[model samples]
Target chain A: AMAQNITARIGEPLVLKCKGAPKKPPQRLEWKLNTGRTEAWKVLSPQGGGPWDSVARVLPNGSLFLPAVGIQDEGIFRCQAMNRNGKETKSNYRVRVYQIP
Target chain B: MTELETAMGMIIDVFSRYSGSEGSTQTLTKGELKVLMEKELPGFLQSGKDKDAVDKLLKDLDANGDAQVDFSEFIVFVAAITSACHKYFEKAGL
Candidate 1:
């Protein structure tokens, strides 16, 4: 339940790995950007806001990948384990993007 | 990301979701392959009737003879599927 703080420079690659994920019976791992809503935005899944969405991806090893991090993409990100086992294990990432110029 | 990057993201996204289930991150064991085929692309895979099908598939794809399928091997399989999908019903998209 504890949140991990992540800082990334703009236009740099960032990968956030999940710490405690259920290894079995999980159908898919999801990287969510909590918009402060009942339905969070799924960054990793095929579903997107539109054709022109952020370049966030959920990698195979329970990690979230941002090929080039950005200010528009940084927020309270949540990596979730999805299944019907009635158990939910999620890792929270508090992301911050800064520029050095 | 652009369209191709978006698609590539989805591709690696799918691969990562399955390949990380067991053992190694890049290696999909035979059991992991079964689970992936069962979960994601059931229509593309119909091997539940024939138990020997996945074994043979693993045999065909496991180039290094390690009995596990990796991205290098699985990419070819997906390329084949993508080609099939293109020919099957790709006449209605932009």
Candidate 2:
């Protein structure tokens, strides 16, 4: 569970670089989002994934980008990096959203 | 180079980066495989569960009995065994 926590504000952008990107060629990986459920994951990819949300997408270099983080975006986002030979690694970020006070 | 084209390019480079490290300079030996996994994929090694883990892995993945591995073999190995990721691609349409 390579996970961490971060606080984000409404409409702000966030970029989470994958921690496991082979130190070199990082392409064709995935960024998965889980609002809460264990397996109910929404996959996002820059190289491609599930119908992506308008605000959250991945870059060609394999980083999760949230152009406008939303309240509904509050949850766990994971970077799923896989090697051609089956060396897959996952890193997670649990986002805590803060509304303007 | 969005998905298909880009992904293929990346894999090609990935193969080159490691394969050129030793041996044929175009292919990989057990030693090169060891370094590739150790550096690229850290989890598989643990790295032995602690010994010969790479040997078993190489043996299982090495088809054609050349006492070596190449991108062709490596790619197919994933196609067959890495169904674990197919599910992800299925959803992402990747």
Candidate 3:
């Protein structure tokens, strides 16, 4: 997992991508924030086999949206992988949301 | 740090805990969550008054009121809190 994208502003949009999966086409992709305890606020299920849209999502791809990044958005996030037969696994990434200024 | 970062760090730490030794995904039981609140957060996330909040979260995860949390369930809680905190910072014109 990596922070491939970065921004220099608070409460701004930032993209956090996760790489390396058990196989192609992930069962589900979720975007969450850690507030002491974990919280899964949204999910992105793609159409067919491509990028995902948070709402009305369904496919076998991995990716999620964080419309805007915020201080509270900071923490460890895990991008998961799962298929019926195989084990469900996840890769962890730490997003550092900072002010561009 | 941006709200995303702040929120992400917190989420990752908790995930690591939940993921546990065997794939470390303990899938926290409701009782476990309570223990966290009472010990870790301390007065921040108490039970009873927070029942509605917890139930609302379970609903968001599509867990249908189950107290146990899976990776997906954990993600929902993280996203909502992070977004909420960020919204406040933005609305306050920070």
Candidate 4:
């Protein structure tokens, strides 16, 4: 469990990046928003080895972007890189939202 | 190491590790890199703050903020795969 720091406002965008690519194109990679038992996750577009643009389309390099940080977005994110390569590599990242008080 | 050799390794690693069509695997496209920028490296330059990290990185490279990172920035992208090299080193335990 790693604590990732983020600074964002009510309507600001947040970006979170991770690294992984399956041998074969994934059946599909999914993004889930974890809010306890009622886990609601959104499948996000994955992009490649570069910087800050969380969603649009999945790129080959396995990078991710979280746009617009909201109260609802402040939760755990599970990125499941699923492929036919046997099992999936699951990595979790936390999104801590900070706003001007 | 010569730039060519370094670039070759980067190409091989990126190609082997990244999932993409053969034609698009070699070069790290802008979009490809952007996803990584937001998702993983929060502390890297400026990220997740309602601003664009890639634009900042490119502007840094352009110096004058001309909106592109000419040859030098391009060179650094592949050349300074040092952070990435470190990942392999730790894995290999060299």
* lDDT tens readout by residue for model 4, A1-101: 44355555676755455555545443444343345543344334333222223332234466554455676666666555444344544455665656633
TM-score of chain B of each: 0.81, 0.76, 0.55, 0.37
List candidate 3 stretches off by more than 4 Å.
A1-8, A20-35, A40-61, A99-101, B1-94
lDDT of 1 at B65: 86
lDDT of 3 by residue, A12-63 (tens): 6554446535545545544443345544344434333222243223223334
TM-score of chain A of 3: 0.51
lDDT of 4 at A57: 29
For model 1, state the Cα shift of residue A48 in Å: 25
Tens digit of per-residue lDDT, candidate 3, span B36-91? 54455455444543655555544555574555667677777666776999999999
Model 2 scores a TM of 0.48
Residue A97 shift from truth in candidate 2, angstroms: 2.0
For model 2, what is the error of residue A56's alpha carbon versus the real structure, in angstroms, after optimal superposition? 21
Runs off by more than 4 Å, candidate 4: A1-3, A37-40, A43-60, B1-94
True-vs-predicted CA distance for residue A100, candidate 4, Å: 9.9
> DockQ of candidate 3?
0.09
Better candidate by DockQ, 3 or 4: 3
Q: Which stretch of 10 consecutive residues in model 2 chain B shows the poorest summed lDDT?
A: B42-51
